[PDB]
């Protein structure tokens, strides 16, 4: 690996490396050596874990997960690896060097902070000091995080403290305003929930039909007398056929609503009881043999689930609004409960008897009824500590960005502080534009929208500027342009006697000009529109080998006859031409018009979980594509541009979301942003707590930062 780094350094000094997208050549180089040294550590790290014998007590502590980990084994047995500080290799402290022990500009691994040794062989002197540098960043990080998080937590508790669930189970604060109609939108307790799988998100419509449908045609497989017992006698029933056919009709409709609720296609939801483990407790105790024939009537199952559905009271009432509240609030548990306890599912898979099923119904009823949150509780305070706690956990400014772009979407506590304050001017605002279908599978369409979205000022497009003295173009000092002057004899042939003899000539960079796909008439029309008709412009052909633009300034002709004393106080036009030259650059906003410009990068996403679509088979599918990620805020206008998605275009900046999309859209975006920051550690803070947090800040339309 060291020879391979010297090899990459040899390629780099030759000037021929060919840089990586969106990066300077040093970054391409730095990204590459960093890839090699990391791969070097991981290869020998994987070698040492293999080489360990069965009896290594060190491996026995790592494997139980008691204390310590794989990386420690890597460092003690193998090789410690590249140290870094602020996410980069050890800086050049002295003139172009880390220590006087090295040569100036020495990008090798060791010379800039790679530790070749293991803790067991001991570190060499330079490695020790670069290791002592890696030691500080962690000690300092510790002292800061303790102060900041102590403050963030106190402020948060101090807001929410008076929120609490009342005895009619609506959650209200001190002045008795309602926060939620039901706590956490279902009225369940957070300590009684569990992760569960939703059966009905099963891919393929045909596959769902096969596994769930209770057939009546009976395939010659001992039908009616296989699995089920006396049920062979109710095969002739019309009513039972129509009622189950009605059951399956609800399951297709539930499957359809459930696909709308979870568009991403995750089956993991928090719900009470865990119906599947209960069926197992039920099977295990009654001594149910799954090969022996069944002893259960299907209608007993279907109606029993209806009755249980009615017993699971979460909203007491009787009028149409209470029934709708009861029905919608425990929609997600109810569709889950029908899916688990399905007649075909029950009969084939779980094989439960009648006595076992009646008992099972009775426990779920008792556990669900026990799960409903206890009014009186302090819910507001409970939530602040569950939010406060992950701010305690990890990362202040450490870089682990793997989204192939800018560092942007600041990670960790400083980002949390921004959402918490609702900063009118975030340190790093962002915005994600998704692109319309056709323009998303093609690069060239993507390039054309990208250029329209970018914001570039003529100063960036200009290679160079010059100002010349040339009263007579017909004998211009710039003899090569002379061909153009003859080309523009008919270009207003009369007011050449009147226009100022001062000349501005601009030359444009050829690659950069082409990249924006601009044409000269666009520039001329832009500059004409900005300064006015007074600014007399001419330009050469876009296909000449030296792409050039020539600018003069025309007056008002008739009235300028030295009336009083020229109401300009006799400003020389050259001096004025600099002010035109200055402002022409600083002002001209072609394509993109405000604060975002072309800051772009363009990205291909195939890694993430984007563009999740439905297919006619019924199953979900991945749809890779081009998406545009910007580093700026202008959501109101940027939505209205063509082929930009008016649906999934989003921004991390909650103040701009407020302006455009109102208070409810803030409530969601802020939740996603708070969820997303907690999710970086992925300790998974329970959602009900963040809903409560968002509701308190968005409670009264106007944004109420907790400041």
């Amino acid at each position: 690996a060291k020879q391979d780094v010297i090899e990459v350094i040899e390629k780099a000094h030759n000037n021929e490396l060919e840089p990586t997208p969106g990066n300077t050549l040093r970054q391409t180089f730095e990204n590459q050596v960093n890839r090699i040294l990391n791969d070097a550590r991981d290869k020998t790290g994987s070698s040492a874990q293999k080489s360990l014998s069965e009896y290594n007590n060190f491996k026995s502590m790592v494997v139980s997960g008691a204390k310590g980990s794989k990386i420690n084994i890597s460092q003690v047995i193998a090789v410690v690896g590249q140290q870094n500080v602020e996410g980069k290799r050890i800086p050049f402290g002295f003139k172009h060097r880390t220590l006087p022990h090295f040569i100036k500009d020495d990008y090798g691994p060791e010379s800039r902070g790679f530790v070749e040794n293991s803790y067991l062989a001991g570190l060499t002197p330079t490695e020790f000091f670069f290791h002592a540098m890696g030691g500080r960043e962690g000690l300092i990080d510790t002292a800061v995080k303790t102060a900041e998080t102590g403050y963030i937590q106190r402020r948060l508790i101090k807001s929410m403290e008076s929120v609490m669930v009342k005895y009619d189970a609506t959650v209200r604060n001190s002045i008795n305003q309602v926060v939620q109609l039901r706590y956490g939108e279902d009225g369940l307790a957070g300590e009684s929930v569990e992760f569960q799988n939703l059966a009905t998100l099963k891919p393929s419509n045909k596959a769902f039909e096969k596994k769930f449908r209770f057939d009546y045609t009976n395939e010659r497989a001992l039908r009616r007398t296989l699995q089920e017992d006396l049920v062979k006698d109710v095969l002739s029933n019309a009513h039972i056929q129509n009622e189950l056919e009605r059951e399956f009709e609800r399951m297709r409709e539930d499957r359809e609503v459930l696909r709308v609720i979870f568009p991403t296609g995750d089956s993991k939801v928090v719900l009470p009881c865990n119906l599947l483990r209960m069926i197992w407790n039920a099977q295990k105790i009654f001594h149910i043999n799954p090969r022996l024939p069944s002893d259960l009537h299907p209608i007993k199952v279907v109606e029993g689930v209806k009755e249980l559905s009615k017993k699971l009271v979460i909203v007491n009432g009787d009028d149409p609004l209470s029934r709708q509240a009861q029905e919608n609030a425990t929609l997600l548990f109810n569709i889950h409960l029908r899916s688990t306890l399905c007649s075909r599912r029950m009969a084939e898979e779980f094989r439960l008897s009648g006595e076992a099923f009646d008992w099972l119904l009775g426990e779920i009823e008792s556990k669900f009824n026990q799960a409903i949150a206890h009014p009186g509780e302090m819910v507001g305070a409970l939530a602040a500590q569950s939010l406060g706690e992950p701010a305690t956990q990890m990362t202040l400014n450490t870089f682990h960005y793997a989204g192939v772009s800018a560092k942007n979407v600041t990670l960790g506590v400083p980002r949390l502080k921004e959402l918490i304050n609702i900063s009118k001017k975030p340190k790093t605002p962002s915005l994600t534009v998704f692109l319309l279908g056709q323009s998303a599978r093609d690069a060239e369409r993507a390039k054309d929208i990208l250029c329209r979205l970018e914001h570039t000022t003529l100063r960036k497009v200009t290679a160079n500027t010059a100002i010349y003295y040339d009263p007579n173009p017909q004998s211009t000092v710039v003899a090569e342009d002379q061909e153009w002057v003859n080309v523009y004899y008919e270009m207003p042939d009369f007011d050449v006697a009147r226009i100022s003899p001062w000349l501005l000539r601009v030359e444009l960079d050829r690659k950069h000009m082409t990249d924006r796909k601009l044409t000269m008439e666009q520039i001329a029309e832009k500059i004409n529109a900005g300064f006015g008709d007074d600014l007399n412009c001419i330009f050469n052909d876009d296909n000449a080998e030296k792409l050039v633009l020539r600018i003069r300034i025309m007056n008002s002709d008739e009235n300028k006859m030295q009336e009083e004393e020229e109401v300009v106080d006799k400003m020389d036009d050259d001096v004025f031409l600099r002010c035109i030259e200055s402002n022409m650059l600083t002002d001209m906003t072609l394509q993109g018009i405000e604060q975002i410009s072309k800051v772009y990068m363009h990205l291909p996403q195939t890694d993430n979980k984007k563009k999740i679509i439905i297919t006619e088979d019924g199953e979900f599918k991945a749809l890779q594509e081009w998406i545009l990620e910007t580093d700026g805020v202008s959501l109101m206008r940027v939505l209205s541009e063509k082929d930009v998605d008016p649906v999934r275009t989003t921004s991390n900046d909650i103040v701009e979301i407020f302006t455009v999309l109102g208070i409810e859209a803030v409530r969601k975006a802020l939740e996603r942003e708070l969820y997303h920051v907690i999710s970086f550690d992925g300790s998974y803070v329970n959602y009900r707590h963040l809903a409560l947090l968002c509701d308190t800040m968005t409670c009264r339309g106007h944004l109420m930062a907790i400041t």
């Binding site: 494997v63 139980s64 008691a66 569990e194 105790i285």
Partner: protein, 50 residues
């Protein structure tokens, strides 16, 4: 646990491999206990016991 061959070993017919832990009717049938069985895990023995 580290054990076996994630994603394709249990499908390699279940030569019990002893790694995976199974408990039934209050008796430990097979496997080895670790932090993922006993720790602060979402599905640890301790959570189920409560």
């Amino acid at each position: 646990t580290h054990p076996d061959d994630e994603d394709s070993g249990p499908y390699k017919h279940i030569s019990p491999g002893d790694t995976k832990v199974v408990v039934e009717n209050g008796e430990l049938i097979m496997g080895i206990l670790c932090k993922k069985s006993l720790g602060t895990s979402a599905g640890s023995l301790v959570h189920i016991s409560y």
